[model samples]
Each structure stands twice: as structure tokens, then as C-alpha cells.
Target: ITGTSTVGVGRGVLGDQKNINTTYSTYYYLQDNTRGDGIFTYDAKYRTTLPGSLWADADNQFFASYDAPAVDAHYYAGVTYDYYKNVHNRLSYDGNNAAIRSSVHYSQGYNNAFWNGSEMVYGDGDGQTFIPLSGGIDVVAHELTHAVTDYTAGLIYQNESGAINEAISDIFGTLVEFYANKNPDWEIGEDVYTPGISGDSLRSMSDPAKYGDPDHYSKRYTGTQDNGGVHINSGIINKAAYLISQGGTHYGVSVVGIGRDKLGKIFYRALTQYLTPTSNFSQLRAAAVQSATDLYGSTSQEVASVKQAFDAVGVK
Candidate 1:
């Protein structure tokens, strides 16, 4: 990837046209040098492998159907990098300009995407369900945020801690979605989930119950599936996040809307400063309260809203 940085044009999975940064060293490669260290994307070639091959092109123009996922993965990684660096003053996921890497088309009809501890991996979903995951900017940001959590809070991915981890990803994922400003909503994976089903998403931050995810702690899942319901129980925290950004009354509790900027600042501070590997839901409430207090003041409306948001979700 060490070559003269260049630019390439491509069409994404959703048939949208965008330009991506590339590098030229005999061939135009999907190695973006515009951000931190660099953003690199790869081709999985329908196999279960890590960082298959750095995507190469002949004319720096990508229009083939198979190239769609790589286009979005590479382009969205740049956007995620921009969000962190410009909005959060953080470079890359590690804040040290770690080279961001991703592989698309991972396994035949694979239906999920993940951070994999080092690089981003996207699956070309069985066409009946999903098209290509990276086409959804929120999904891309969500996976990359897992890397942010790993390097900072290192929250253990099980039980309540894991639920917090998932909610953190969702929270920032939504924020990044808004930052990019493309059909933004308080929903996750809407753009790339269920090609046949419109107005349906993987989860909803504004109303988790629409998808049968618990909106209150009392209704939380206690079963052991999904790593102790990390995904299922995240709704409780996700609702709190939504309430903090947009005022809402939930289960007889009302939270004042403080807007998304403040919500992101408080949560980012809590994630980097107060959270730990084993912190549970109660601890998360305390962390959010303390983070808001530090940023806004002990008696400020921001701190009060943070407390109210958690209380509304029964996180106390």
C-alpha cells in the first residue's frame, strides 16, 4: 500500500456513485492515504479468510457488481474516520492513526459483519435478506465502534457489560449516521437490512419494542442465548440514549431533550473515562451521570437529563 496516493471512482451496492482514495503501485489499489495512517479495503472472494487481498483495479473505475461491497466498505471507512477525527478529535479507532482495514464478500451468502478484533469484515448477505452490509453507513460505523470500545473501555462482551458494549456501538453508530447526514434516523441497519421489507430495521433506538426488544429493565432478557442477550437487552440502554437526544416519556418517566451533540459528548466521555471491563448497568448510570457532571455541571440540565434518561430506562 506504500505508493503514490490517488483517487478512484466507483458505484456502491445501492447503485450510488462515490469517489474513494486509492494508491497506485503498478495498479490502482483500494488504499486510502487521506486519513490517519490509511484506510485499506480487501476482497474476501467468497471465502472465510481475514484480509484476503488488497483490492486492485486496472483503470481506477469500479462498476462491476462484485466490486460494490468493497466500494462501500472503503468509502464508509473514510467517513467513519472523518467522524472520529473531525467530531471527536480522535484519530482512527485507536486514536493513534491505526491503519483501518476491511474485507468484503466474506464467505458465500454470509449474513453478518464484525470487527474481528483487528479488521472489519462484511458479508454479502443472501440476496433474499440483505444485499451487502457495508452499504449501510450505520452498520459500518457500528462495527468499527467495537474497535473503539476494545481499545478504550475494553468492556467484557457478556452479560450486562456486553449489552452496554452493544448499546454504545448503537449510540455512536446512530450519531455517525447523523453526522454523515444521509437519510439519518434513530434506527440501526435500516439501509442494508431486509431488501424486501422497507421501513424495517435490525433495531430501533427510538422505539426498541417495535422489534420486541425490551425498552425497560424489568422486561430485560435473562436467557443465556446471544451471549446472555447482549443484543436483546441493549434496547434498555438504547432507549435511554434516544431519550437523551430527543425528549421522551417512557414508563411514566420523562427526559428532557438535550440534543445529539451533548448526548455524544457525555457518552464519549463516559466510555473513555469511567467505564471498565466489568462495569454493569448500574455502574453505567453512575458513569453517565458523572460524565455529564464533568462536562456540563453537577446541577446543569445535561446532568439531570442523563440521570433522567437512565432512570426512565430503569438502569438505576
Candidate 2:
């Protein structure tokens, strides 16, 4: 819609006040024209319907209790976009400045969020298992990173490749969280997952086994559930990534910490340049090794850490 670009201030799901990009025609709409084509947020209104209506407010201020999710959904999408463009020099998820869209309040007690292969969708969780998912920047980035994976490696969403796909999202999602520098940690979805629970998350990169996820490749699930245990098996890769960023000893193997920036560089290069639809854990190890080699040279500690991190996780 033709309108004047404007800024609106609002409190997010966590009651943190933030500024959001909006457009004012007759009313304020959740559209940020400053980023890409625009970052748009929609209201699902507790229904299964997608991208429901463009979230519109009669006034330029968003303070209603119902507006919290939309505020975070809209704001966090911009933050993720900035992370990719500024940190990785990528235009957007497609490597083109494509519009980023999100829908909030997707269903009654939905309890989950996903990319759905295009736009981000958030659930108003069951209150026990989760709160509004958009409240977690890591969760928001996780789903959007799925769109990133789709456009890049196009990793097949089953078996090993699918696990790689999930791990990539978790990896980059955590990076985006740290990039935001808001209570950054190796935990995933700790902010919005399980409102009644404390000090726990949907998954843990520092220790994936905390939630019964496999930190070692030998423990990977062979079942057909969860698209070949994409979520379950991602722990193997997540642990490898964590070890690369922060050194640790696992299963008698040790990795040297090369830090998050180098970790991100290696993984982003692997995802964009080396990975494919069927790349398995071994292939991913090779990709990361090659990526680290390309970025930091074959003899650099970065390359060695990449190798040792995979080795530590039994990815070999």
C-alpha cells in the first residue's frame, strides 16, 4: 500500500520497549520499508490461516497486550536481516533483497514456530511449553534461518541432510542472538520456551544431550520420526559447531576455540558454497574443513579446530 514510512514504539513480548518500522496510510501497518523490499508482519489471529491480515493499528503507537507478538515478530525480522547483510554481506535469505514476512498468533496454543519454506510463522504457545515464540530472538532467527537454508544449500529435509538443515538453523540462530547481544548464550529458545520453566531451552548447543539430543554421531536416531530425527540428530552438528566456537574436550577428542566470528565465517561459507541437498555429516566435515582452510588457510588453527571439532563430535 502507498503510504508514508514511519516509526512506532512498542513493548515486545518480554515487555522490552523497542522501535519498529511501520507505514502509515490511514493507519499504522507493520511494514518496514527500510529493510530489503520490506519486512512485513501479519496477524494470524489464533487461526491456521497464513499471513492473515497485515497488522494495522489505528494509531502509530503499539502498546496493547495483543500487539506484543507482532512487535517482536516485526522487529526481530529486521534484526535478523541486518545480521545477514552486515555480518555476512548477503542481501537477504535469497542473496537478493527479498521481502521478509512473518505471521504471529498462528493458532490457539500452537506451541511451535517454523519457516514453512517461505515466510516466518509464530505460535502463541500453550503457556507451559512456550509463550509467544516471537518473544525469543533465537527462535525467530531459527525459523528465518530455515528460509536461508532453503535458498542456499536446499538441503533435503530428511535423514542426515535434514539434520544438517536443522543444525544450520540452530547455529545461525544462535549467532544472530549473540549478534543482537541480548543475554547471549549457547541455549536455544530459552527466552520464550516454557514460561514456567527456568534455565532450560528447547535445545542446547553447549550440551545438546541436556534435552536428550545426540551430541555424538553414534547416538543419532535411526527412526523415521521427525523427518528422520532432524531435530534429534542436529545435536551432533550443533555440538561440533559449539566446540569450534568455544574449545572443549569431548569423548577424548579436543577442539581449540576459534571464537564465534570465525565459526560463523566457516559455517556460512560452507552453507553457501560447499553444502548440497544430500550432504551428510562427513560431507559437512569436509565442507567446514575446506571453508576454514579457504578463510584462514590450511595451516591455521581455525582450520585445525574445524577438523578437531568435527572429530570431537564423531562426525568422521
Candidate 3:
């Protein structure tokens, strides 16, 4: 997968909640109705290696009497599918009637999870640095969001495009977490990693400074690691979105108001509804401002803060 990272993976990586009936420019809300069918598939394959004991599997596979893996796989897949559908109103990768698939327990001692451009794959982890990557809601969102990025933006996996690509995944990934309200602290992946670190989150939506490492973005941020530090440099934009939504002190004084989440809503709206394939950071910034103005009105303080946040991230 070209994009798969939490907010905290090596300082490299990295929602919306709305009524189903409410409609907007980004996604339309719809009521959900589930009809259980035994022939359904969840764990497509198990080529990955993860750590930690496998969680409870509830559904018994039709192939054999075994049901635990199938159940857990189906359970979480449903969670992810519902998250995207109910919140984002996206039908699948192409927004068509396509179906999404996921495979749990991929490879032995696998340390990371990924989207294989088709299905979501999970690692068992090395039992040292990581565990099952799917244990966290946001981690799952991160991988799936990769498919979304591929569909839109298509940020090249090198230099600035790559960084933006990775940042977008993290942005939605955290939104998935917050959308679910799954964790107590808006954290990303706490259950998938060791207990010593504070969920490590893989990234921070509230404060990018928390995951500080040699790779963290700064005014002097360098771009030599992780493919021009796509995963690393993403922090600037990531933190910028946070500022735009949640309201915060401008980072470099270029952006002076609001929080990233709010700005993110506007950006997400534009990216999905209007952006083109070659869109870059400047276009992204402009699209966001346009969306904020259109939705919140030109004189709305929210639109002003969104523009300010974009500038703070060097979007000009």
C-alpha cells in the first residue's frame, strides 16, 4: 500500500461525526440496515505475522468448525466499514458499490499493518515493539485511508507529495478514532503496541510536538528520512489541521486562529468533491479556504481561521 501510517509510526505517520440524515457537500448520510449472512468473508488471508494473543473470534467459518478468527475479523471489518459508510458516506474505494475486504493475522511476527491496494492486511507484530496492528480503531482507519488517498490527491510517494499523502491518511485516521470516540484520549494505537509508551498514538492530533523525535517537523525540519520524510514532515500539516479545527495559538505566527479539525473538515470536503489529480499544497489550501467560505460564509470567523491555519503550515 502506498499509504499506511498512524500519527506515531517513527514520527512518520499518521472524522467527522454527523447525523445520518443530514446531507452536506462531502458525504450524504444514510440509515444502515444489516442482514446477517453466513457466507460472508472477513479474514481473506493470514500471510502476516503479528504479536500478542489473538482476540476472541465470534463467527464460525463455514469452511471448518473454527469461528474465532472469522468472528474477530468480521467484527472489526464491520466496525471499519460502518465507520466509513456512516460517517464519510463513501461506498468504497471508488465510491461505487464495491465491497471492502480485510485479512487478519498476516505473517508471523509482523510489526506493521497495510492496505495492499485491495484489502486491509494486519500483522501480528514482533511482540517487542508492536503487537497486532489492527487492535486500534485509528490504525485500521489509517490503512483504509491509504486507499482513499490513492483515489484522490494520489500524492507521489516521494518528497512533498509523499508527505502530504501520508499526512492525509493520518488526518482521517485520527478522525476515525475521534469519530468512534473509541479511546479515552483521542489516541491512535494503544492496544497494538507495548504498554510502556502512552499509546504512542503514532501521531498526535492535538499536539504534534508530543511525538517529537529527530524526525519531528520544526522550522528547521529536514527531509532526508522516510522518503523525504513524508511520514515525518507530515507533522506540520497534521498539526496545522489540528489547529484549524480545535483552535490554538498559531505555530509560526503565520496562522493565527482556530484548530485543525475544523479546517480539516473543509479540506476533506474539497478534496473529495472538487480537487483534481495534480492538486498540490497550494491548491489544497485554496480549496479549503474556498470550502470554508462557501459553507461558513466569507465573513465567518471559521473561514478566516482555516486560511490562517493553512498559512501556518507553509501552504502559501
lDDT of 2 at 236: 96
How far residue 272's Cα lies from its native spot in candidate 3, in Å, is 1.2
Per-residue lDDT tens digits for candidate 3, residues 195-256, read 45644756665566676622223342555778777666677777667767665565545444
Query: How do all models score by TM-score?
Result: 0.99, 0.99, 0.72
For candidate 2, write residues 1-316 as lDDT tens digits: 6799999999999999999999999999999999889999999999988889999999878888899999999999999999999999998799899999999999999999999877999999998999999999999898989999999999999999999999999999999999999999999999998877789999999999999999998899999999999999999999999999999999999899999999999999999999999999999999999998898899999999998999888888
Candidate 3, superposed: residue stretches over 4 Å from native: 1-73, 184-186, 213-224, 252-264
Model 2 Cα shift for residue 170 (angstroms): 0.5
lDDT of 1: 0.94
Off by over 4 Å in 1: none
- RMSD for all candidates, in order, please: 0.7, 0.7, 10.2
lDDT per residue, candidate 1, 1-316, as tens digits?
A: 7799989999999999999999999999999988988999999899997889999999899999989999999999999899989888999999999999999999999889999999999999998788899999999999999999999999999999999999999999899999999899999999988999999999999999999999999999999999999998999999999999998898899999999999999999999999999999999999999999999899999999998999998888
Clashes of each: 0, 0, 42
Let me know the TM-score candidate 3 reaches against the reference structure.
0.72
Once fitted onto the true fold, the runs of candidate 2 whose alpha carbons sit more than 4 angstroms away are none
lDDT of each: 0.94, 0.94, 0.56
